[PDB]
Amino acid sequence: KIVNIGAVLSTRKHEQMFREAVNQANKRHGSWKIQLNATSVTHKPNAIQMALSVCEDLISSQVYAILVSHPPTPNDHFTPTPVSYTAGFYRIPVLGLTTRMSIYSDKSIHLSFLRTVPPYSHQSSVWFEMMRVYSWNHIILLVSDDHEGRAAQKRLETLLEERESKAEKVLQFDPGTKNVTALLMEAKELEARVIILSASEDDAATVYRAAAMLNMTGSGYVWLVGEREISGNALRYAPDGILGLQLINGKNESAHISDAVGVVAQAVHELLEKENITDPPRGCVGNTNIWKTGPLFKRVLMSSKYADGVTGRVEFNEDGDRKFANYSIMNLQNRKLVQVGIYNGTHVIPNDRKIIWPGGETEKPRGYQMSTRLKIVTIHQEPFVYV
Amino acid sequence: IDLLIKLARTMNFTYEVHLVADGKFGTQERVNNSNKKEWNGMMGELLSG
Amino acid sequence: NVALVFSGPAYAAEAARLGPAVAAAVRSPGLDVRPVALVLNGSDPRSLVLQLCDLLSGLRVHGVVFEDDSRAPAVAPILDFLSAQTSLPIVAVHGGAALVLTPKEKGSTFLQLGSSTEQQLQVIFEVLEEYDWTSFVAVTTRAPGHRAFLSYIEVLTDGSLVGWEHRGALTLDPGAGEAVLSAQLRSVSAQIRLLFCAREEAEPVFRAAEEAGLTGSGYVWFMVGPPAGLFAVRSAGWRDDLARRVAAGVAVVARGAQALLRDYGFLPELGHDCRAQNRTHRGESLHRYFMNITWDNRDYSFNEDGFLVNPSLVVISLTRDRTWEVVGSWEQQTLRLKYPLWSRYGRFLDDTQHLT
């Protein structure tokens, strides 16, 4: 009778901008009875009140898909964590935005969770396109021992064995670093000079201080830094030639929402068929059953093609992640970032402005630098090797 | 070890010979942990790094 | 002072009797147990967090055991976060919260009194080699973690001296069709089809066995996930009946704080507050304890995630009268079982190629 969706935005001020995405329900396909009512609500200060109101305030509006934005407070997916848990039992698809957490990928924990922005795990996939056009094969990296940081660890080697002879060292450091210096000299023998950072922002800043007394930031080095570990304290004490990345749609929600609501109202159009199209289970005093039309239209939303927005490339894989997104890797140049390239499925590297390296050098250095000292093993063998 | 010295005179690289630890030439055998085969002796010392 | 939560109206009557049943079941000096009877019902995500917050704030209930009437795993995620929010361990002995939810959130105190599918896969690995069924076809369905569920099969296969086979090309769903799935099921290596499937998908695949001729004893299945001659392991699903489920559930929880108590004199007031304090970082020693707690002559040790590592697993063989009974046990790799393992060709289970 009426098609309605809900959303969990950041602030009530931005809620009025979401209504502009639901009042435009007339200019969609069919437009027979598509009358979207936002019925949005600002996220509660904590996670306790979310579960105390999600059932009878958001779901009770006969909503079908939920839009979740990043909270203004520096939290760790605080808003969608109980919402996914609550909507997971209710079998309600949820659309995420500005939530670059890689733990929201396995379907066992969150079967119903799709986000319009790829998390930090997909950064390593784009990173693989960098040394292909920069001519390095040997590679070592240091990474935190947490699920978010380690996400890139299984990302790289799954696409490295077919294009390289394995990373030289994949040594890891505990995220709770406290003057952890012994983990750097133990890695300063492989002569890689191409180290990669995929750690948390606070920890990435911590290792920067430890990377000074033994001058690993001099000439002949190249560093890869994740987007999360650039701004803030990680910017301080960092090498001058940081080759980190960012996102074009960083802190952008209306563009993401408009691309989102373009597919929330779209999937309902082809839904109308002779099959089961019953509404989600209404009521909150008693609810145990699962509506059978949930997974039926979930694949349609995943398989829906939307050639609008940012280059019309809002594509979904088996997980909910943007495909062929433009990351446009940054470049630190004297305590400020400059633009040097972009990714469009294949990395594009325009000249733009010079690319600097740690130590102030501009020419890209060969990270091998050889190793004249060599280690040798023999054994006692009377005619050959006396002892 | 003489053939080793002539080798270092050609490729211009240094060395520090250290004898093998266990004392066996090397043979890929399965450890007690199921059948995860692991080398020993020189081969273990070379593959490990 | 402990809290017992129920999921199902049929278990409401048993609440009154099960209270005193566990107060005197476990005796430990220095701590008194006061079971709390509950009345709520329904799986909706309102009463799950409503009474629990009130119970924690006033009653100060330490130790929660979860019993559910249904096998639906949607109740665990709602309860999983609340364990992390209050930093108090919660155990589940029977019902929907049997499958281990992985990967759990950081700082999660949720615990489950059951063996994970990785543990389930390990114990059934012994069954096939013990009865000489090394060859088999790997079969599964569209499940949230079926890719990871079959991943452990690859690790299991080619392990040790025994040579095993796996297909992994099955994605059982009604869209393909029972006959088409049977056509894909003909890519077989033996009479055994190890199947991972859910309770929702159990009915569609049950009929597909009839179409493929798997009903008879000639071809047998193997149900690892939550037709005749079907093999399964419930991980002590039918064990403990009803009284032992909760009696042993709190014994480990009560003894968990003993290690901290013997280390120093401190009473953790984390469970006494739910909302009066607007802080979520007041959590420590979430999994610091629970290494070597044992009861009922069994190892009740739990992994870091919060599931049994050495449980009293049982083996379930489907009987012709639609009855599930314990046909084997896994107690520290003891596979004596029953029904002598010699058997073969006449029990449980091409003359042009095979001849005595």
Swiss-Prot record, chain B:
Family: Belongs to the glutamate-gated ion channel (TC 1.A.10.1) family. NR1/GRIN1 subfamily.
Name listed for the protein in its UniProt record: Glutamate receptor ionotropic, NMDA 1
Disease: Neurodevelopmental disorder with or without hyperkinetic movements and seizures, autosomal dominant: An autosomal dominant neurodevelopmental disorder characterized by severe intellectual disability and developmental delay, absent speech, muscular hypotonia, dyskinesia, and hyperkinetic movements. Cortical blindness, cerebral atrophy, and seizures are present in some patients.
Glycosylation sites: 12, 32
Full-sequence range covered: 460 to 508 of 938
Protein role: Component of N-methyl-D-aspartate (NMDA) receptors (NMDARs) that function as heterotetrameric, ligand-gated cation channels with high calcium permeability and voltage-dependent block by Mg(2+). NMDARs participate in synaptic plasticity for learning and memory formation by contributing to the long-term potentiation (LTP). Channel activation requires binding of the neurotransmitter L-glutamate to the GluN2 subunit, glycine or D-serine binding to the GluN1 subunit, plus membrane depolarization to eliminate channel inhibition by Mg(2+).
Subcellular location(s) of the protein: Cell membrane; Postsynaptic cell membrane; Postsynaptic density membrane; Synaptic cell membrane
Quaternary data: Heterotetramer; the NMDAR subunits are modular and harbor tiered domains that function in concert to regulate opening and closing of the cation-selective ion channel pore. Forms heterotetrameric channels composed of two GluN1/zeta subunits (GRIN1), and two identical GluN2/epsilon subunits (GRIN2A, GRIN2B, GRIN2C or GRIN2D) or GluN3 subunits (GRIN3A or GRIN3B) (in vitro). Can also form heterotetrameric channels that contain at least two GluN1 subunits and at least two different GluN2 subunits (or a combination of one GluN2 and one GluN3 subunits) (in vitro).
Entry remark concerning the domains of this protein: A hydrophobic region that gives rise to the prediction of a transmembrane span does not cross the membrane, but is part of a discontinuously helical region that dips into the membrane and is probably part of the pore and of the selectivity filter.
Domain of life: Eukaryota
Record note on modification: NMDA is probably regulated by C-terminal phosphorylation of an isoform of GRIN1 by PKC. Its phosphorylated state is influenced by the formation of the NMDAR-PPP2CB complex and the NMDAR channel activity.
Curated annotation (Swiss-Prot), chain C:
Protein source organism: Homo sapiens
Subcellular location: Cell membrane; Postsynaptic cell membrane
Highest taxon listed in the record's lineage: Eukaryota
Disulfide bond positions: 53-274
Homology family: Belongs to the glutamate-gated ion channel (TC 1.A.10.1) family. NR2D/GRIN2D subfamily.
Functional summary from the UniProt entry: Component of N-methyl-D-aspartate (NMDA) receptors (NMDARs) that function as heterotetrameric, ligand-gated cation channels with high calcium permeability and voltage-dependent block by Mg(2+). Participates in synaptic plasticity for learning and memory formation. Channel activation requires binding of the neurotransmitter L-glutamate to the GluN2 subunit, glycine or D-serine binding to the GluN1 subunit, plus membrane depolarization to eliminate channel inhibition by Mg(2+). NMDARs mediate simultaneously the potasium efflux and the influx of calcium and sodium.
Linked pathology: Developmental and epileptic encephalopathy 46: A form of epileptic encephalopathy, a heterogeneous group of severe early-onset epilepsies characterized by refractory seizures, neurodevelopmental impairment, and poor prognosis. Development is normal prior to seizure onset, after which cognitive and motor delays become apparent.
Positions annotated with a glycan in the UniProt record: 41, 278, 292, 310
Gene: GRIN2D
Name of the protein this chain belongs to: Glutamate receptor ionotropic, NMDA 2D
Domain comment quoted from the record: A hydrophobic region that gives rise to the prediction of a transmembrane span does not cross the membrane, but is part of a discontinuously helical region that dips into the membrane and is probably part of the pore and of the selectivity filter.
Subunit structure: Heterotetramer. Forms heterotetrameric channels composed of two GluN1/zeta subunits (GRIN1), and two identical GluN2/epsilon subunits (GRIN2A, GRIN2B, GRIN2C or GRIN2D) or GluN3 subunits (GRIN3A or GRIN3B) (in vitro). In vivo, the subunit composition may depend on the expression levels of the different subunits. Interacts with PDZ domains of PATJ and DLG4.
